[PDB]
Symmetry: C3
Subunit: 168 residues, 3 copies
C-alpha cells in the first residue's frame, strides 16, 4: 500500500486508468476499482491516490482515489450520503428522514427534459414540452384544480343567476 498524489487519467474501454505521481509511476495505472462512485479531476488536482499492490507484484497496482480532503463534507451525526467531488455543499444526504438533495438546480431525464430550479425560495419546474399529472385528484391547498374543478359564478348585470362553470 502506498499513497501517491494525482496527475492525469486515461479512460479506456475496460475502466479508468490514473497517472499518479509521488514517483511518476504509470503513465497509465491499472485502475480505479469503481465501487459505484466515480469522478474526473482536472490534471494535477491536489488529491491522494492509494495503490493496493497485487501479490507484491509491483507489476500490477490497483488504485483508490479520495475526494480532496478540504472538499469532504462534514456529515452530521446519524447522517450520511454522497457528495460532489469538488463541492462539500452539493450532495444527496440521508438523514433522519430527509432524502435531501442540496443544490439550486436538479435535472431529470435522458436529455435533462425536466429541470427543477430552487432560487430565492421560488421553485420552478421547467420542460420544453407537456407536463401531465396522472392522478384521481390534483389539488392546491386542498382545493381541486384538476380536470374536474369548477368555478362558482355571480349574477350577471341583468340580475340573472349563473350555475357553476363546467370543468376545464
Amino acid at each position: 500500500f502506498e499513497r501517491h498524489v494525482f496527475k492525469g487519467i486515461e479512460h479506456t474501454d475496460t475502466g479508468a486508468l490514473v497517472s499518479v505521481k509521488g514517483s511518476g509511476t504509470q503513465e497509465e495505472d491499472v485502475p480505479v476499482i469503481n465501487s459505484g462512485y466515480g469522478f474526473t479531476p482536472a490534471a494535477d488536482t491536489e488529491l491522494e491516490v492509494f495503490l493496493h499492490g497485487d501479490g507484491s507484484d509491483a507489476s500490477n497496482k490497483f488504485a483508490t482515489m479520495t475526494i480532496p480532503r478540504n472538499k469532504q463534507r462534514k456529515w452530521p451525526e446519524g447522517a450520511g450520503g454522497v457528495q460532489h467531488p469538488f463541492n462539500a455543499d452539493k450532495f444527496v444526504q440521508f438523514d433522519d428522514d430527509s432524502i435531501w438533495l442540496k443544490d439550486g438546480k436538479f435535472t431529470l431525464g435522458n436529455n435533462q427534459e425536466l429541470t427543477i430550479t430552487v432560487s430565492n425560495g421560488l421553485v420552478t419546474l421547467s420542460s420544453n414540452n407537456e407536463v401531465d399529472f396522472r392522478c384521481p385528484k390534483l389539488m392546491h391547498n386542498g382545493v381541486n384544480i384538476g380536470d374536474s374543478h369548477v368555478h362558482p359564478q355571480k349574477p350577471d348585470s341583468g340580475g340573472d343567476s349563473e350555475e357553476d362553470t363546467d370543468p376545464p
Copy 2:
C-alpha cells in the same frame, strides 16, 4: 491483497458474504465492507473482487467489489457521483450545478407512491391518490392557477355583464 473474480453472494444478518473464485476460496467470504454503496450481481458476473487480508491471517479476508470495468461511467471533468452497477447511463451526477438524476423513471415513497416519468419530452407525475400543493402561490407561466385563481367572463347573449368567477 489479491484480486479475485466473482461467483455468488450469500446475504446473512451481519452483512454480505461474497463467494469469489480466482481460486474457489470461500464458498462464503467474510464480507463486502460496505462504505454506503452496495449491489447484487447475478452469479458468475464478470467483475473483480479485491481481498484485504487481516493480519496476514488468510483465515479472515475482507472483500471490496468493483462495478464491472465496461459499465463504469466516464465522468466529465469537475463532476462525479453514483451510478447503477450495470448501466453507465443511469446515475446521480453532481456537476457545476445539476444535481442530475439520469433515467426515464423516478419513484419516491416507501411503496413508490409518486412516480415521475420523463419520456419523449413529456413529464408525467403519477400517484394513485391525492397530490396537494402547499404554498402561498401556485402558478403556471407566472399566472395564478391555485386555490385563489379566477376567470374573467364575457357578456352573455342578453348583453348583461359578468363579474370574474369566484375562486375554485
Copy 3:
C-alpha cells in the same frame, strides 16, 4: 491491514480523523479517505474500521469505514446504489429503471425550500414561496389547467347564453 472498531471522530480542515480502538490507537487517526461517500456515527457505534498502512510505517495509517453490517441493504439482483448509513430502508436505488428514492420526505434547495412529502399515498409539494411551472402546456389527466385554460359556461337564469370564460 487490520480491522479495528470505531470510537470517535475528529473533523479537521484537511479531512476526517477517526479514533478507532481495537487497541486505542490514535486518539486521532490520519483519515477516512473519502471516495465521495461519508457519514458520522455517534461515539462507540458498533462498526468496523479497516486501516491500510503506509509503507509498513505504522506511523501513518489510512482508514476505510464500513456502514454497520446489520444496517447494510440487501440489494436485489441487477440493482445497486447508495443508502443511509444507519437505515437499510432509506436509499437511492438504481434498478432496471427506477432511479428510486426511498423515504417519506425529500428536500431540495440550499435551505430545503422545496419539500416533497409522501405519506399514506398523499403527495405534498410544499414551499414557503411561489411555485411556478415554466412549460408550453400544463395538464391534469390530459386536460389543460395552465395559463390558457378556460371553462365552458351554462346559460344564466334569463336563458341567455354564455361564452367560455377567458383564461386565468
